[PDB]
Structure 1
Amino acid sequence: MLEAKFEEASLFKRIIDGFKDCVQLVNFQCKEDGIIAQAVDDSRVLLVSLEIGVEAFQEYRCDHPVTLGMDLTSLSKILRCGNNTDTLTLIADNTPDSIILLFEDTKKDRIAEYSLKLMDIDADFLKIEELQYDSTLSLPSSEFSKIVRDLSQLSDSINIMITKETIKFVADGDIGSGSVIIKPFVDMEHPETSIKLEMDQPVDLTFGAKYLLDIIKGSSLSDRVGIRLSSEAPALFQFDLKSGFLQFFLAPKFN
């Protein structure tokens, strides 16, 4: 018996929005310490990783480990029905063929009950962790979003360069080139605008803009994005739920 009751229906809606455009069919391994999910895109370049997060629910009852294979398009359609704001509780039995999504309003009866047929994958359960990153940074997610959207007009490839006290995003194409340079700072009165950098060694990586445009959709989840980069490892892009996370693992362009 699963009873994942969210405080806010938009919260689950916002989570799923960060996935839907890169991955379609995905298993949601419910445990008793929350819900873990993981999926790879078709090109085998981007891995999405989710972790909620008992404290991100109002309540979370889950008697026994349960896997919910869901088509995210179908799930979206149901998550558009969230009369914002409304409490959303996910109900599913121990051996489920469907998932009940219940929307309740504070003043009721104004109850909405949706049912969604499950699909079975047939996945990896690929829990592999964790690497040594050359540099790790955090900046406002909306800032990182604009940077990616802007540079994407210039090229199919975006370069990320970390030197001493410098984070540099570069794009180069037919039109011409573009460079965004940001330096670490803290504003004590507005710590959420801060740019933080930790460097063990410099990094020169080049990424598919196609994938980064998808990654920055996690912007709705957190006002900050964490970025960890290695010379010979996939990049990690992370938006923090409070608490839990949404993670993206990207393969860079080599040779």
Structure 2
Amino acid sequence: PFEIVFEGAKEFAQLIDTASKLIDEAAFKVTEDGISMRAMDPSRVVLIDLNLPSSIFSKYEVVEPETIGVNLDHLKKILKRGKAKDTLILKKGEENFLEITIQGTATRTFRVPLIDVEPELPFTAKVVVLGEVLKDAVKDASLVSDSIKFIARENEFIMKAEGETQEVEIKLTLEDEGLLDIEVQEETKSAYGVSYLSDMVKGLGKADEVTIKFGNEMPMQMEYYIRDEGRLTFLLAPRV
């Protein structure tokens, strides 16, 4: 059982919408320290890891911890009309139901039946970029290919792609307001699938500060924060 309240329904819905792009349903583990969710996409190419600590909620009480199955698509629809300033309440008693309340101009509560749902990497590069850069870079690349190569060096982050004819190169340095930070341990190179990145960055926000870590022909870790303490992390297998 538990009653959890997050202030900013719209923002919570977007977090959930970002996750629904890769996965359809997931198990949310509610403990006293926060909510966490972890799942792999159908094709086993992308892992999504979400962590929302209690400090991000205006109210957080968990009498007895528990895991609940959730269909992201169904949750998505329910949260669709939550507004930017609406209050969101997630409450569960002993029964197998989830009570979702969206409180703003009125108090709207949904009762939805719950359904059960059943290795540190040595990244040699890290960059922090404005979500707009990834969103634009992925669409640019899609115009010429289904593959995009990530290249990182000191003060230089490069994403490039090339198809049967045209090619595109998106480059950033610290002078660019698109690159917020760069820490490279050595020239790092790896390639990834444009479609997967497209789904990963779709829900991404234009001004969100995204962190990216990867290694040579190694998967890429992509994360961005929620109310500073929250975190949504993507782990994407490479196109070696």
Q: Which runs of 4+ in 1 moved over 3 A?
A: none
SS of the residue aligned with 2:82? coil
Q: How many residues align?
A: 239
Partner of 1:75, secondary structure, is: helix
CA distance in 2, matches of 1:34, 1:134: 30
Q: Following the alignment from structure 1 to structure 2, what is the Cα–Cα distance between the partners of residues 250 and 221?
A: 21
Shift in alpha-carbon separation, 1:221–1:76, aligned structure 2, 3 A: farther
Identity of aligned pairs, percent? Answer: 27
Alignment of 1:26-65 (within 5 A): 26-65=26-65
Check whether the contact 1:14–1:221 (CA below 8 A) recurs between aligned residues: no
- Specify every segment of 5 or more residues in structure 2 that has no aligned partner in the other structure, as ranges: none
RMSD: 1.8
Give 1:103's aligned residue: 102
Question: Aligned residue for 1:237?
Answer: 222
Answer yes or no: is 1:154 the counterpart of 2:152.
no
Distance change (3 Å), C-alpha of 1:53 and 1:102: same
Deviation at 1:11, TM superposition (A): 2.1
Between the aligned partners of 1:88 and 1:97, the Cα distance in structure 2 is 20
Matched, 1:206 2:202: no
Gaps of 5+ in 1: 123-127, 188-192
The yes-or-no answer on 1:118 pairing with 2:114 is yes
Asked whether the 8 Å contact 2:69–2:117 carries over to 1, the reply is yes
TM, length-normalised to structure 2: 0.93
- Name 1:77's counterpart in structure 2: 77
Q: Does 1:7 align with 2:11?
A: no
Against the structure 1 CA distance between its residues 232 and 170, is the aligned structure 2 distance closer, same or farther, given a 3 Å change threshold? closer
Tell me the SS of whatever aligns to 1:253. Answer: coil
- In 2, Cα distance between equivalents of 1:233 and 1:154: 23
Relative to structure 1, is the Cα distance of residues 148 and 96 closer, same or farther in structure 2, using a 3 angstrom cutoff?
farther
Q: Deviations over 1:170-196 (max 9, x none)?
A: 111124111111112487xxxxx5521
Q: In the aligned structure 1, how far is the partner of 2:125 from the partner of 2:68? A: 36
Shift, 1:99, TM fit:
0.5
Q: How far apart are 1:148 and its partner, in Å?
A: 1.2
SS in 2 for 1:18: helix
Q: Deviations over 1:130-178 (max 9, x none)?
A: 3221011101112221111221111000100112321111111124111
